[PDB]
Amino acid sequence: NAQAVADFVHAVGNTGEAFVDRGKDFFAPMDFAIVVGWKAITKPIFPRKIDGDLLKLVHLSNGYRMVPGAEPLKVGDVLDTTAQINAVINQDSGKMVEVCGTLKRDGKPVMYVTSQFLYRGVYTDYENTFQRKDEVPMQLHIATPQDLAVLRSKEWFKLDDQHDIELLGQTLVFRLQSLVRFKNKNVYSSVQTIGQVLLELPTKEIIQVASVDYEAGESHGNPVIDYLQRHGSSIEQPVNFENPIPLSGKTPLELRAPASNENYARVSGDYNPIHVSRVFSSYANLPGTITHGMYTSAAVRSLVETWAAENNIGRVRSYHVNMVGMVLPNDAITVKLEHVGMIAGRKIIKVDARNKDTDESVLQGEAEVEQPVTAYVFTGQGSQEQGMGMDLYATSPVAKEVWDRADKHFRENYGFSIIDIVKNNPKELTVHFGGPRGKIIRQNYMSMTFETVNADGSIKTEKIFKEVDENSTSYTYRSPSGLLSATQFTQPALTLMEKASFEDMRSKGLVQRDSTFAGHSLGEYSALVALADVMPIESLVSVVFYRGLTMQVAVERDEQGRSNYAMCAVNPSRISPTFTEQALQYVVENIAEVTGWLLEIVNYNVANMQYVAAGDLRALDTLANVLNILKMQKIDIQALMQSMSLEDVRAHLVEIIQECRKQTEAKPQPVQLERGFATIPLRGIDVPFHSTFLRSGVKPFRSFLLKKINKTTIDPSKLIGKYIPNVTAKPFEISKEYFEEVHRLTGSPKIANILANWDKYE
């Protein structure tokens, strides 16, 4: 009910514009769940096998947990309230009922309201006490055949007949459900555990390699969870801090129980006389007219919204309080909030609420709340430095291994270590094709397929490593300024440091679920693998290593090592503050079809600040000129596109072009570019990459990508719409319209073919 919502809010104390139908949001408190589902949540207390004095019941605990991906409650919603009894156990404090609510919209679950009630008193009715706990995900790593042989020696362990994937040398996941019935508060009358034994392939394929089934009565402990609890470890669990970060501030948050619980009772459904009438509560041996359990919860929980998530409720994905203090009306209450951990990109927030006079605990519990809006961007070539991410290497057992697996790869296949190249940057390095594993290496050097087609139309398929044959004992890499400076190495190395670094953050639960990620030049590949498991790390480095290779062989150079082209960055601001993006474009595209050479804005980095052009050396000389003229010439492109029509400024430019052009052919000696007004050339580039030049070898790199990437490995759910490519300035989408924006910018024959069939994809 659109109204019932605003009634609840205005009753507990919540104030978020997310509830009041202004601004950008109109949702309903997740607190409303126990108002909506109040039926199924309460019903199950009544059955005959749970015979308690419902008058002496108290609300004991209650937590919500919003299904991953599900949007909060909105007003125009229709919710189906499903519940069942997860456990009824009789503690000494009384008797306990655990109810698990499941609100569903459109048939899909949206949030699970779990609650606990206490029939306070003495109970020996153990006949109907029981529990269905979801036992913790365990990770059992099998190393010795003796390890295996014991995992198989277990009766409760049941191997599947899917396939004989030798469990040896791999690890297993034991997500187990189990059901227990008590007799003594100590002795388990009868226990049963079942569940699924998972395995992850090298392709991230999850398989039920086996299944668990244990059962027994008159048990003292769970023999299955125990076995796991020693031979294995827990999984998907909290990463707490050494130093709990106060969020609350040292100014304790203050709440007051209102007088007259009626207000809540109305908007809630809990008319329970306990909270409202004098005589009813008095009969139940209460301190009298006890403020509503769930009201305290709701009130403090609002602070958790306002203070943790900063009023964007979508963030607050989990909340769970134990009420352990009875709050009368008008009681002053203190709330402390503390960032004390992380899980799957979500801040854990310890919540403590106390009686301002007694400091007695009213509420205690934690809330899993999403981080502010985050965006992960991965840097590209140029920022590489010697020994990068090596410190983090020694310190992080995780990143430690990322590097190792990559190195292990490189060494055994290409015959060198990138870790070495990184640590001590060699001005040269040479690989050797020794014995058995020696020859197998050169094979990979020989099997490097370069591709350049003749100006008649025959696809010359050439070697990348020309001089490497079946008579070669060694190949030698050389760079004048260290091999960590030439890309075949520069790239896999940069990729590596980044993957590792990120994988560490992930290790500590810092990586946010719903965030975006983008990479620059190289950085796109790392960024991809970083958040989406687009491919194994050995694939990644191979991929990238090839990229660097092709990128270097693309251009033609001569005997002196003299390269044909070069790149240069241009700051349009330094010309005239009237100089725009389209302005520098006009300058270039004109020089393009006038002097016929190859020139092109390859980098669009900062609005009116940083751009980069590639192309012929003379093309960079004439574009340097034109701008050096216009800066000292003092122009105004806005005023001059009205005072002269379009073909007037156009033909006026073609003037300056030929002048500037022929003066460059006067220093015809391969050309030698220098720093201009805003035109500062980037030292150390041979190839005009990110231009229509590399269109050549786009074909071979694709077929290579197809070798290194496998569809199966891909969760489109990770790229979903959260990944920003470098050709589409907009979020990766799988829509029929995207493939068109791609095809427009690219001309992919694979895309045309897949756009023509589009119906086929339904």
Partner: protein
């Protein structure tokens, strides 16, 4: 001339001065208008807003029961409670002279109010009897009660980011409300900054100019959250109180203005209090103050003209629009022809509209008197 909400959260302190100092004179209408409210507060639409209660006499008797400054400043309590203080002043003036409400009412030439004050101003122009006074007194008070009440429910207070909250506080501004003040800065510019801000905002949360209190004094409304966004820009433009500029060309200096939020609980004189207007009218159709019952001219809020120049319509309808929609062009509606003395009965001592207008009219020869308090800190006001 009658004041209103304008940086005074010590309004209830003024009531104590009254009750304390002039017990005989006022004790009567205090008690009655008190019980009037106590009843209006029980009405089901209202109890929501007065959880801390609306028992004025209690707070007066036992100081410890007096609610938080936050509570009293809220519209639903601020409005009517304030009117009572403006009444008690006019009442105390007449009574101390040994006059009737019609005696002083005759010896003025024109009355106006500042937003919420225009109600007590029009209603004070009704009374001639002490019986006729108490009538218009319960009229104004209960009117204010419903204006503030229903206004609050139209656009209620929303919670803000605790960060941007302390921010606005430390940066010299106040706790964020829907009512922003911009002194020392010309409308020309103020609108340009309002323009840029409204540029990036959705139409829902735009920003209007609530009142024009002088050529360099204004007020601005809109959601507090977007009013903040104006302050962000403003801070980037104005200069620190430190910067010495005695060595900088004048046309090139940085303008030194004073922006700051105001203790006002709701977006008045803005498209935001739309739904509230209708509701209010239906609470007040019972009472009818026609254009005729105005002895002395009552000058409109938005335009300087009278309310007597009407065919005796219920005044309620015009009053309510002037407050919940109409841009108080105060400087024009207060350009009293050939005035020589102007008297402030409005709320708050040297804070009342007396000074605020005294400046508007310093040179001309208009003098000002604050009936609100017997002495104070200002030299330019008797």
């Amino acid at each position: 001339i009658f004041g209103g909400q304008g940086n005074i959260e010590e309004y209830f302190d003024e009531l104590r001065e009254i009750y304390t100092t002039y017990p005989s004179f006022v004790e009567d209408l205090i008690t009655s208008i008190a019980e009037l409210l106590q009843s209006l507060a029980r009405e089901w639409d209202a109890v929501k807003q007065y959880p801390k209660g609306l028992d004025i006499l209690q707070w007066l008797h036992n100081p410890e029961s007096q609610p938080d400054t936050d509570y009293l400043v809220s519209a639903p309590v601020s409005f009517p409670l304030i009117g009572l203080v403006q009444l008690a002043h006019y009442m105390i003036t007449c009574k101390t002279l040994g006059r009737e409400p019609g005696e002083l009412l005759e010896r003025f030439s024109g009355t106006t109010g500042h937003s919420q004050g225009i109600v007590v101003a029009a209603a004070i122009a009704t009374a001639r009897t002490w019986d006729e006074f108490a009538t218009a007194a319960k009229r104004a008070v209960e009117l204010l009660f419903w204006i503030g009440l229903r206004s609050q429910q139209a656009y209620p207070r929303t919670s803000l980011a605790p960060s941007t909250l302390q921010d606005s506080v430390e940066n010299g501004e106040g706790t964020p409300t829907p009512m922003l003040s911009i002194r020392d800065l010309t409308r020309s510019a103020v609108q340009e900054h309002i323009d840029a801000t409204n540029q990036h905002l959705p139409e829902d949360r735009h920003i209007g100019i609530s009142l024009v209190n002088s050529a360099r004094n204004f007020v601005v409304t809109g959601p507090p959250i977007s009013l903040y966004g104006l302050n962000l820009r403003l801070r980037k433009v104005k200069a620190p109180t430190g910067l010495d500029q005695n060595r900088i060309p004048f046309t090139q200096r940085k303008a030194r203005f004073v922006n700051r939020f105001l203790p006002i609980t709701a977006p008045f004189h803005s498209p935001y209090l739309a739904g509230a207007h209708a509701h209010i009218l239906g609470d007040v159709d019972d009472m009818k103050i026609p254009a005729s019952s105005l002895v002395i001219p009552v000058y409109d809020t938005k335009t300087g003209q009278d309310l007597r120049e009407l065919g005796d319509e219920d005044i309620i309808p015009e009053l309510v629009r002037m407050i919940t929609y109409d841009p108080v062009n105060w400087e024009t509606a207060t350009v009293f022809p050939d005035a020589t003395h102007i008297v402030d009965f409005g709320p708050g001592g040297v804070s009342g509209i007396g000074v605020l207008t005294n400046r508007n009219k310093d040179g001309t020869g208009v003098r000002v008197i604050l009936a609100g308090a017997i002495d104070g800190t200002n030299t330019e006001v008797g």
